[PDB]
Structure formats: structure tokens, C-alpha cells
Amino acid sequence: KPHRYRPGTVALREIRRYQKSTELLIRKLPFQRLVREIAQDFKTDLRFQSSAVMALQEACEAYLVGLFEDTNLCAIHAKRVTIMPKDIQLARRIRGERA
Amino acid sequence: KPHRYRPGTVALREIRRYQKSTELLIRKLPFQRLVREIAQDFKTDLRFQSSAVMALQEACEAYLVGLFEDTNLCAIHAKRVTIMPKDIQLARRIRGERA
Amino acid sequence: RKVLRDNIQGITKPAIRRLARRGGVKRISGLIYEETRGVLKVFLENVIRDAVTYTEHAKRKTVTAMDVVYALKRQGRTLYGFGG
Amino acid sequence: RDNIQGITKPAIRRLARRGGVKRISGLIYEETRGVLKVFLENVIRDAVTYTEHAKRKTVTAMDVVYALKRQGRTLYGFGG
Amino acid sequence: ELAGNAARDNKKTRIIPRHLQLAIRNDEELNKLLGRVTIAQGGVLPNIQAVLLPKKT
Amino acid sequence: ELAGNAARDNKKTRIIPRHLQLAIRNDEELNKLLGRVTIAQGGVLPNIQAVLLPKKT
DNA sequence: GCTTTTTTTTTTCACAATCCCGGTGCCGAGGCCGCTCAATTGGTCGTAGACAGCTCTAGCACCGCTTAAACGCACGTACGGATTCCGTACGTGCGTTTAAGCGGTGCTAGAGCTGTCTACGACCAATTGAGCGGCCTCGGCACCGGGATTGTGAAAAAAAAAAGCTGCA
DNA sequence: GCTTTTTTTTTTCACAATCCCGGTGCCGAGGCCGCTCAATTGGTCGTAGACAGCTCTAGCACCGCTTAAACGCACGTACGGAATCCGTACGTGCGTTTAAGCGGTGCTAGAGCTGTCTACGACCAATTGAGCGGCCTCGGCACCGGGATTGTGAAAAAAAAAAGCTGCA
Ligand SMILES: [Ca+2]
Ligand SMILES: [Ca+2]
Ligand SMILES: [Ca+2]
Ligand SMILES: [Ca+2]
Ligand SMILES: [Ca+2]
Ligand SMILES: [Ca+2]
Ligand SMILES: [Ca+2]
Ligand SMILES: [Ca+2]
Ligand SMILES: [Ca+2]
Ligand SMILES: [Ca+2]
Ligand SMILES: [Ca+2]
Ligand SMILES: [Ca+2]
Ligand SMILES: [K+]
């Protein structure tokens, strides 16, 4: 009974699954730590409201999901199904997030 | 025999020329007429200060010139040298211009 | 006075080819030229409509360079060298 | 402190799922990480700048929201 | 009006961000108005680029 | 200062829009600040993507 | 047209995901209540701007020439895209490990509020110099012609591959 | 190892475009000047917000559970990307055609400025109720669960088509 889905088939399931849901996809503490880590470099011994870390996550993730959407199109524009660094750089170059 | 530059070698000449210069590349009257043609559609019997038609042109040519930049990057992303309408649409999709 | 012609065609193939030269484009599909015109058209609609609104609000019958400028800045396409 | 690695492969995959992405090169997980970092820097800097101007030591939701808006990435549901 | 519909289709009496995010993103005009806005806890509209879906059987 | 230099460079005594554009576009920071700005009569920086040149030797 | 074999089509067995029942449990929507603070009522006072009327900027129309530019076609190159092909970088799914998540307890920075007092900014009237518009000239810069430099490309000679023999064995 | 053909790289000019100078002329930068209106001075008066004092909120630290999620390896399939191939789409260059651009002229809508009066909105003090913070209840919704359903594959099994044989009129 050695049952295996072929490559790409759970990926699709996942795509369906997560587009359908709203919960945040990055684990919260690690995120929190990252915020705090980055915070330090500007001003030491800061604090955060929990709600300000959540606004930051909601924003970052949304940023990222969106960037992926555009990345995915850039993949497909080069007749690929697999997103690659260069796709992201094009997405951002066109958006004007970098030169 | 007669001289004849290889396909691309003048195109590159043209590129160098036009990037080096600042002069407006659409003919001034046809642009004028087109502006008035579009103007009508919102309000009939309208006048334009030349400076306003010119400000429209500067703005247009600029927009179009950037779009070609983003477009050429979309072509080159698909391992092409030749820009296509599918390249433009991607630039504009990613830019946020259309859905 | 007079209602205008079909001018969009006056944005010739030469001109469109020149603009894409300025943008570093080497080779150009046949289909580009008409697609550009449509894009160009939509651009001018969008700006001019906004400009004309600034005209109409000021109760003037003559679109000013500033109308264009205010519209263009509204559209996120800020233009230097014509006022404001 | 290298918390950037807390942004795991799995979490990154998930995000890209929701972006309708099907297959993902191995080099992307780091590329994503950098991008994500640059975004946070730009948002947090601004946020904290609002914090320092109100003479506080505690970053607020509003600080974030006001930054995000400067950055064009306006956010609904945290006190706009 | 639109979110409240979206709830009533989900078998819910409370409007929630998703209902709001759905209402807005599936409405050409509203979507445009709120083009550069993020609805916290909204999620996205289900959408899988065709090329990625398998040859249908 | 910058415009001026790019004018001297052109062997031109008076700064013109091109000079402004070259100053601004060639300077990482000025460029960012004026990211969504359109200089009239400014043109663009000489830039031909690499893959569009023929094979150099 | 037969055999064989390779590709494609069809069914036939599976499995997460879904849905409809039931049932249960908890916390935050949603409403109540006792203020209070912010909208309302009324009248006074000062000027912002609709409106009429004049000026005169500059926008539109019209024409006929010069020629730069657009148009259309002849022609073939190097481009796009299809097909075919191999290596491995990817996704799926084990099992073992990790640390997030929760619920809760404990401490205190610091957020935020209150009231108090005065330095500082609005508001005015009079004073007056800088920055306006108008005006004039002259040197930079646009334009051209002419000559030096630069780079493309064709065709003809050296190197430098496959690409197909010849053994060899 | 040989041997010829392509094939690659190098050599030799011929041409065409581009670059660069001095020369010539035109007009707009540059600056002077005179007058106006908007900055400055030198007053007063009110309240914005700095400051100290206090409350208590919500941010922080730590602990120990119980998982669900991360991780790290084993195995292979489908995907990316190189290589090969053919057809023609698009660049180039030519002669023909078209109308933009030039400048000039005349005619005037309408931009834009002034002066006159008043409706309307800020700005007082006074009345007051709609909406605020706090707090209490209970039903919506999360959660489970189970068992039926279906939508979604994947494998294996059947059909059709491909490739290789063939023999035959
Ligand atoms: Ca007045
Ligand atoms: Ca304090
Ligand atoms: Ca003076
Ligand atoms: Ca002056
Ligand atoms: Ca001078
Ligand atoms: Ca006070
Ligand atoms: Ca392929
Ligand atoms: Ca309440
Ligand atoms: Ca109470
Ligand atoms: Ca209730
Ligand atoms: Ca119930
Ligand atoms: Ca169940
Ligand atoms: K606090």
C-alpha cells in the first residue's frame, strides 16, 4: 500500500488551503524576536506593544504574499513553474523597490 | 557590392542617439490634436495653454519611455531580445497600473 | 468650433520606435505599436480627465499647465519644470 | 542574535503558497529573507522615529501604522 | 451591504475581516479604491494561475 | 554642485535640465528622494542592457 | 496488412477534504447605565468671495512654402519557438527533535493623566528694504560646414574545431 | 593517427557615421533700476505645552507543561536548461509621398484683475443629550467528532497509434 502523491500535487492542495485561510503564516515569537533584533539597531532598550508587533506581522506577511504573486507571474513569463531569485528581483525592479 | 549594416547594428546606434538627447520624440501637432480629441470626451469647447499641451507631452513621453524600460526587462526575463505586448502587460500588471 | 478627427494614429510607428529606443529596446514585435497607442491613450485620458476636473472646478474654459501638473502629481507622476 | 533564520523554510513556503506559487528554488528562502529584512528595516526605522519624536521608549501600534502609511503600505484594523 | 452578504453565504451572523476582504476584492470599484491598502486578517482571493493546474481529466 | 559639474563636463557654462537629470539620476540618494519625479527636458541616462550588445571580441 | 512496441486513452481503486448531523463550552458582541464633554442654540462682528465690469494676454485660425519625416516595398538575417534530450534540484513522506504556544504568576517601567505657571507665538500698527516687473546687451550656445577618428563588415588568408574515414585489434 | 571539410579566429582594407573644431549670428541670461508690498520692529495679551506628581496599565521575565511544527534524511519524478532545427518576422535601405514645422498675419474668447456689497462662517457665552468608558449575559461560534460524501489522484489496465517488417501488384 505505498501511496504517494506525484510532485506538485500537495503543493496545489496547499495553495488552495492557505489562500482560503487568514491566519498568519510566520511563527509569532521568531517574528517578534526579529523585530526586536532589528529595532535595537535604531534605538536601544525599546519596548513594543504586542499589537504593534502584530501590525508589523500582518504587514510583512501581506507584503510577502503579494510579492510572491508578482514573482510567480514573472516565473510564468519565462515559461517556468518554479519561482527563482531573479523573478523576485524583477518583481522588485519593476515595482521600484530597488534599482 | 553595396554596404548594409547587420540587423541590430543601427538599432543600437538609435539607442545611443536617443538616450543621449532630450528632445521630444512624438511629433508636436499630432500630439496636440490627440490631446484635444481626448479633451472633448470630458468637456466640449476647451482651450489649452501651449505649456499645458507641452507639459502633457513631457509627461507622456516619460511614462512611455519608462514602460519600455520595464518592458525590455520583461523580454530579457523571458530570454528574448524582442519586446512584445505580453511584455508590456506584465510591466503594467506588476506596476499596479491595471489588474 | 470643430469636433476633432481620429488622431491616435498620429502616434506613428517611427515615434513609438524612437521612444522604445530611448528606453534601451533593441528589437520590437510588430504588435507593439498598436498596443502602445492603447496604453498611451489610456494614460492621456486619465491625466486629462483629472486636469479638466481642476479646470472645471476653477470655472475656467482653458486648461492650464498647472491643471496638468496638479493632475499629474495626483496620478503619482510628479512633473518638474512647469510650475508649482 | 541571528533571528532572521527564525523565518523558516516552512513559513516562507506557506506565504508563497498563498501567493499561488507552486514550485520554489532552494535559493529563494535566503532571497526572501533579505527582502523581508529590508522591508522591516524601512518600516521599523520610520516607526521608531515616530516613537523618539513623541519622547517614548515603547513602540505603539500607531507608530507602525503611521510608518506603514508613509511607506504606501497603509494598514487597516490597528487604529487608522 | 456586501460583507454582510459574504457572511450570510458563510452561514455567519458576524461580519469579520475576511467577509470585508472578500466584499472589497471581488468588486472592481472598491478594489480600486482600496488598491494600496492591507486588510489585517483579510487573506487573499483564491486564485491559481491556470498553467500551474494539471491537464484536466 | 552636481548639476554644475555635469555642465562643466559637457563644456557648457549654463546648467540645463539634462545636467540636473544627470546629477540626480547618477547620485544614489538624490535619486531616491526624487524617485517619482519627472524632470522635463531631462532625458535618461545612457544605458543599453548587456545582452543587447554583440559579442565583444 | 501484421507484428511489435510505444503512446494515449480508459477504467477502477484510494484518500484527504467536506459536510451534516449531533453535542459542548467560553468569551466577546451587544446592550445597559450613569455620567460629561462636545454639539447645539443665538446673537455679534468682520471679511471671503459672488458678482459686475474692464483690460489685454494669449489662444485659435488661416495660409503656402520647404524639406524633414513618414510610408511602403524589396530583401534576407538572426530571431523566436518548437522539439528533443539529460542531470539533478526539487517535492513527498517517513521518523526524531525542537521550541512555540499556552496558561499563569510576579515585578515594575513607563504610558498617560492632572493640574500649574509662564515663555512664546498670534495679532497689530507702523516702518521700510528686499524682491518684484520692466528693461536693455552681449556672450554663451545653437547651427553649420569641413576635416579627423572611430567602428562596422565584407572578403580573403591561418589556425582549429568536429566529423567521418582508417585501421587495430 | 589521418584527412578532409566546415568552422573560428585573425588580417587586409573600404565606408559610413560620428565626433570635433572654428566661424557666424541670435536671443535669453544677467543685472541694473525704480517702485511696491511684504517682511521687520516693537508693542501687548492669551494659552499651548513644559514640567512635576501620581495611578495603574500593560509590558516584561520566567516556569513547565503538551503538542504541533520544524528538521533532516531517503528516494525519484518532473522540471529547467542546454542543443538542435526551421521558417519568417522584423531590421535595413531605397524611392515616393505627405504634412509638420516654419513665421506671419488677423480676430478675439476668456484669463485675470478691481471695486462694491452682504451672506455667511468664526467666534463668543449658555444649554444639554448623544456618545463615551465600564461592566454584565448569553448566544454565536469554535471545537470536536464521526461517519457519509465527493473531488481529486494515482496506479494499473485497456485501447490506438508508431515503428519496423513484408510481400505484393
Ligand atoms: Ca476681493
Ligand atoms: Ca512623564
Ligand atoms: Ca538694491
Ligand atoms: Ca528679472
Ligand atoms: Ca551677458
Ligand atoms: Ca491646559
Ligand atoms: Ca521544457
Ligand atoms: Ca460599549
Ligand atoms: Ca457603570
Ligand atoms: Ca448576546
Ligand atoms: Ca447555541
Ligand atoms: Ca471526523
Ligand atoms: K504601560
Coordinates of C-alpha atoms (C1' of nucleotides) in Angstrom, one line a residue, chain H residues 1-2 12 42 66 88 111 121 144 148 151 167:
Chain H
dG1 C1' 46.6 8.6 -36.3
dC2 C1' 44.7 10.8 -40.9
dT12 C1' 43.5 43.3 -45.0
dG42 C1' 8.3 96.9 18.7
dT66 C1' 1.8 19.3 25.9
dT88 C1' 9.7 34.0 -41.3
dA111 C1' -7.9 84.8 -18.2
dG121 C1' -18.9 81.4 8.8
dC144 C1' -14.8 18.0 18.4
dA148 C1' -21.1 10.0 4.7
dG151 C1' -13.4 15.7 -5.8
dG167 C1' 5.4 -9.0 -49.7

